[PDB]
Design a binder for these strands. Sequence first.
DNA 1: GATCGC
DNA 2: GCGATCGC
Length: 132
Amino acid sequence: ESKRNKPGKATGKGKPVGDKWLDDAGKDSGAPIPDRIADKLRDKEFKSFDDFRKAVWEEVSKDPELSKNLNPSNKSSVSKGYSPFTPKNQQVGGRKVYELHADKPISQGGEVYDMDNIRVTTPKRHIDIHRG
DNA sequence: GATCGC
DNA sequence: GCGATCGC
Ligand SMILES: [Mg+2]
Ligand SMILES: [Mg+2]
C-alpha cells in the first residue's frame, strides 16, 4: 500500500516560469512546477495523488496564461483536470501525456505531495531520466 | 516491481 | 479498480 494511495496535504512554494515552459519538460531535469499553481493549492489535504493531479491541471485551465500555449484540444483536457498530450516524438508507444515525476524517488524519502519535488516530463525524458 | 497515467 | 513501459 503505497504512500501515493493514502491521503495527505499539499506542500511547496513552486518556481517562476513562462507560458513556454514545456521545452525543458523534454529536457534534463524537466520543466519546473509553477508558483501560481503552488500557491493556489499549498495546504489542501488531498485524498490521493490522483486527486491532486486533477487539481493541478484544472488550475492550469482556470489560468489563462499557461493554457494560452495549448491547442483547443488540450485546453479541454486540463479543463476537466486531465493531462494534455505531448508532441509525438516525445511520446513512448501508448504513454502519451505529460507526467508528474518525483525528482527524488519516494522510496528514498521523497515526499509525495512535495510540489517542490515534482517535475514535469515527456515520457521520452521520464524514461531517460530513469536511466542516464 | 517501480512509477507514471485514466 | 484499469493500462502503459522498462527491465543492466
Ligand atoms: Mg520516477
Ligand atoms: Mg507487473
